[PDB]
Paper text:
In contrast to L1, the L2 linker orients the DARPin paratope towards the central solvent channel of the EngBF lattice, allowing for larger targets to bind, but with fewer possible crystal contacts. For creating a very rigid L2 fusion, a disulfide bridge between Val1406 → Cys and Thr1488 → Cys was used to shift the three-helix bundle and the connected DARPin closer to a symmetry-related EngBF domain. A second intramolecular disulfide bridge (Glu1476 → Cys to Glu1555 → Cys) connects the loop of the EngBF three-helix bundle with the loop between the DARPin N-cap and its first internal repeat to reduce bending motions. EngBF-L2-DARPin_3G124 was co-crystallised with sfGFP, again under the established conditions and the yellow crystal colour suggested that sfGFP was absorbed in the EngBF-L2-DARPin_3G124 lattice. The EngBF-L2-DARPin_3G124 crystals diffracted to 2.3 Å resolution in the presence of sfGFP and the ED map confirms that the DARPin_3G124 domain is locked in the desired orientation with the paratope pointing towards the solvent-filled channel of the EngBF host lattice. Superposition of the DARPin_3G124nc:sfGFP structure (PDB-ID 5MA626) on EngBF-L2-DARPin_3G124 reveals that the difference map agrees very well with the expected orientation of sfGFP. After refinement, sfGFP possesses an elevated B-factor of 214 Å2 and the 2mFobs – DFmodel σA-weighted map shows discontinuous density for the sfGFP main chain and no clear side chain density (data not shown).
Here, we show how peptide and protein targets can be reproducibly crystallised as “guests” in a host crystal under predefined conditions, and we explain the advantages and current limitations of the host lattice-display method. In order to apply this approach to biological macromolecules, we engineered a host lattice comprising auxiliary- and target-binding domains; Fig. 1B outlines the design strategy. The auxiliary domain defines the robust host lattice by providing the majority of crystal contacts, and thus also the crystallisation conditions. It serves as a scaffold for rigidly positioning the target-binding domain to immobilise guest molecules at well-defined positions.
Author numbering: 340 to 1687
Amino acid sequence: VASETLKTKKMEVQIKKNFPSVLQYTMTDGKVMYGQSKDVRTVEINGTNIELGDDDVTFKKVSDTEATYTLKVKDEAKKIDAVITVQITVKANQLHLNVTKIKNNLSEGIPEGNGVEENAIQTLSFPNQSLVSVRSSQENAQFTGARMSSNTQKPGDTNFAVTEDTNVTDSDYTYGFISGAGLSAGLWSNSEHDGTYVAAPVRGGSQNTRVYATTQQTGDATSLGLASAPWYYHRTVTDSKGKKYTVAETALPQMAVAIAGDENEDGAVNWQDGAIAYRDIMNNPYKSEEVPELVAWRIAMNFGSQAQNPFLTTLDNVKKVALNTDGLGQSVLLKGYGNEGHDSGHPDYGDIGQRLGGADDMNTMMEEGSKYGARFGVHVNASEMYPEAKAFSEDMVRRNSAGGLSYGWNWLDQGVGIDGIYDLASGSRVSRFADLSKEVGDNMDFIYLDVWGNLTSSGSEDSWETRKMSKMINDNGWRMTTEWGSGNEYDSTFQHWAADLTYGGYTSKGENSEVMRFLRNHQKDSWVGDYPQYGGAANAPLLGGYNMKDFEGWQGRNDYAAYIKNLYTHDVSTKFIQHFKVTRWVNNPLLTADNGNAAAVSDPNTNNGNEQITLKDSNGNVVVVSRGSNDTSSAAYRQRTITFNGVKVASGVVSAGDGSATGDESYLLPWMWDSFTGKLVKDSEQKLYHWNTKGGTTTWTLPDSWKNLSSVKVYQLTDQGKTNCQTVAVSGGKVTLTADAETPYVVYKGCAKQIQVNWSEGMHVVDAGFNGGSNTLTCNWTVSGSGKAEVEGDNNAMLRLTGKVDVSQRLTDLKAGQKYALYVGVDNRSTGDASVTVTSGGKVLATNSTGKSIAKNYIKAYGHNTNSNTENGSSYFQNMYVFFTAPENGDATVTLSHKSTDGAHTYFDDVRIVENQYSGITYEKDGTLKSLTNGFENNAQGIWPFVVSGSEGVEDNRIHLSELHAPFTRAGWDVKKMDDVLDGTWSVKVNGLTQKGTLVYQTIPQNVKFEAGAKYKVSFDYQSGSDDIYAIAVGQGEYSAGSVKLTNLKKALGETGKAEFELTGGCNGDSWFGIYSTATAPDLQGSTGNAQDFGGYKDFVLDNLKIERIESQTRTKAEAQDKVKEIRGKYDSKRACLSDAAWQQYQDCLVKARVLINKNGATAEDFTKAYDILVALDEYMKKAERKLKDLDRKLLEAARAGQDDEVRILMANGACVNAADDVGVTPLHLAAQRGHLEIVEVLLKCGADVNAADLWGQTPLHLAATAGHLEIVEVLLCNGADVNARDNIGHTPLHLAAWAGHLEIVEVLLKYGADVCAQDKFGKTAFDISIDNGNEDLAEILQKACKL
Ligand SMILES: [Mn+2]
Ligand SMILES: [Mn+2]
Ligand SMILES: [Mn+2]
Ligand SMILES: [Mn+2]
């Protein structure tokens, strides 16, 4: 065959002129690797194999390093007529084969707007091209392949000898390496082909197989050759509506080989040698070079309009983590960066959350954060959308084969599936990422793509789609990261289900492959880390593996100390290991003959035949990681030694990644790199991180550059940075370190300066989050008063106040004349007021207060929810607001204060000053509320003046600010029957919180204070899905069932309703109103499936809140005094059956009214207030009385029935023991006559009046004696029953027991002391009763009382 030679300094490649084929590679040393030794001239186009003849190919040697081929590819019958241009180039030990041009003689190209290109060239390949091959006739001929596996128990690798029996045909792999006759090679291709995988729960580029292995007979030997899998060129796709499109290539077809000798110099030639060479030709994920610097990964979360984490708070948190890690690199994923938060506004990528501070604050956070080595990225979704999103349209909607919506998940709103193919082919998604690019410029590091590969956008989401998705992202300068462990093998640098080891179990983690991890460990956080309960790959991997925790609200995670502890336990050593590239990996226990890995490398002269990995950097530094034993039953299987240039830098067992068992690992890791591009730092900046799991004393050999030092400087790392400095002597290049358990230390050669941190930049105050330690109360905040101010809490630090104290700070950078809202988180445990005040000079611009906090925090993503223990195992943190105009003098000051001298605490956190246009609060002259209006158009955050209640416990609450996007958010679009927005752009929305039987949301006194005794007109616009499913709740103090006044609301589905009521302020100033979920089932109107959710039959929308104080009729002192008499005359006699707290509330109220009435110099205003407070007290006591009368009537009913359980349930729920009806019959009377001994004894123990009588003068003893209940009569006399008690006739329980003729009951009561002299109105004794009836048996016991 006629050939030509391409030359480099490393090899000579003999190539055929009749086809782009290699005959052989001859290296400088004379070693040879074969190409395609046979006459194979096949080209596949659209699945049709065409064999080329001599006249179908033209050749041209361009230079000594390049040749060009022109391929005439025609099949008239199969509609193929193409001209393919192939380039072969050589450099060093690499050969590249590129398709540089594709000409189609059967088309004019792709029609405008990605229209269908008829006879388009969709696929292209060179079947059995064998660019590199090995033969069974060669010394140590072998194949090594890798396929995708997310399963910890199933490796993705194959390792086998190439023999005469080896028979393969287009066997597809992610990676493929052939070795033989002292040379090795891997084949790289940019093919987007999807094929064979070991294990993956999703698509989304998990199945990308780019190499094809095929055997052929090469004379008397079997030859195994490598070819590229097919490439896509102009691919024709169909969307959910049946519309077809043709989309151009992501890139032109490209492939390469890199010929290796014994690269790691270990005396053998295998895939590892090929893998070292392969790194020079392989694709590298965009920005994969920064991956080793990303030590601190975490999520900063925002959800449901709450603004739990505004961008400038996230920046303070970056500075806290920077101090605690001594400036290690960070990667913060902003989950809910856009619109109203997480799983809101998808897919509006360019809509940055206005309530977080918008694009302005996001850019400030990214720009400033980068100075601390912190990278930022956003969570996006390209599979699900909500009606509120501006991108929402009929074209975007994914539809099923029947024409209906492809529904997603319902939570805040109903998610609808995005038509993935439409989104790509129309240029829609690329334009939405462009919207984001305009907002962030070049400040943002990465994109985090959620759910991609789970088939929500289409049944495909293949490697071709994922390749195009990753390109749109990389094109904007963004690093690619995604959700699923197996997803996007080609371009992703991080998988959430790989780095967060807790999710999905052992079958759904990161990439379980020795080949993939050997090649790319340093480029991704997509592997298997320690999580021993999964076993296999997850049991102490030598390379570690990212273990991700959070503290900023993601899944309620708000534990900072655990976050930091975990960074040092797993992530510091994982990241240190990623600064080196794998060069050798022997004795892998996961690979056996049974799982298809008989030829896997097994050296008994390395680490006793146990697992070992060697890694190297471009500076010749060597890292060696060794496993103690390859037996999982041995204690040494989890033992790992790490050496750096032959010196031990880490030893022992890590604390289990699943949090199940603490370890003993200690390390002294040299951190030689900067937190930016990872370049080597200078000598004065070189440092060592020290960690000791169990704590104690360890001795280490310092690195070579430290061997002549006399001493080192050791600093303990905290949330304040470098503390407790120690000078440690160096003897013979060694150091002894004493360490507390699980405590980070940093070692320097000399004195090291503290990292400079200016807290709360752009926040208008210094240290708004109280992160500056105790010192913050000295030069940032000024403290005054007899009381005390402390920075308290070992997690999220807060300001704690006790006694009479004020904490002040000057406000900076305010725009003169502009409107601002200032809010602060407040938890008040004191009865004394806690306040927030803005002053200019001395003048008060705005002020607000809270008494004892009455509402617990149920916001899961928030830093101080009721699961975080602010004090006493609870948290009452709620945002307290002030609205003011920035003064013209530019002098403004905030003051946080506690007024009373009591010892109870008040907590404050997160002082937020934000530009805000809300102006719906009007006051009276005395500073009390005149009116409050809200259309929710200018809310700084949350559902203010309401606060979320406990209907779902601590949750990502299904309550938020709904957004207008007509016609989609309106009633009538699809199966939707309710409007999301009543008027304007925003309303308050509740999604499906039906049949809870509890409070959903409520006002609190710090948001809307209802003055004691004052009357208010409350009105709002609403939309409710069904009749009586939701109600208006009115209460005083902390919500409690039974104490609440409920008004059921009627159905207002698609048509806005009006709600109006009057509210009278409770005596303690703690009155409130809200929305309550009843027990009543919604009317789903015959809807099925998602239509029950989307319809709105179970939802509640509120808007246009209006609260107005109603003027009261003026009262005199006489009127108020008389009202005191009336109230006392009604309730003074009702102390017995009334709670000890209810009697206290009543007494406190009477005291309050008397103080107003009797003050020297009291006015009409005081007399009106005193009278009104008593009127409010009356209605409160009366409502409580009807609820007690309800319980009493049910207790008298259960006394008759005889059920102890329902008698005890009612008594425990507050039932009156001595409760009598219209005829004066108590439950002790009823239980005694029926004879329920278990109830009689329960009632007597509870304090029931044993002497109690009805309108007939009958006591429970009279009733029990006539009925003849011996056991009941016994216990009554033992509890103090009146033995000689009489009725309206004069019958003692002796007379009645004789009338009924009870032989055993008469004798029992006589023994105790029942009178025999007793006579009724007729003057009849027991002598007359015994002689009247036909039985003389009674006359025998009476003649044994007195003998006649
Ligand atoms: Mn080797
Ligand atoms: Mn804080
Ligand atoms: Mn509105
Ligand atoms: Mn919404």
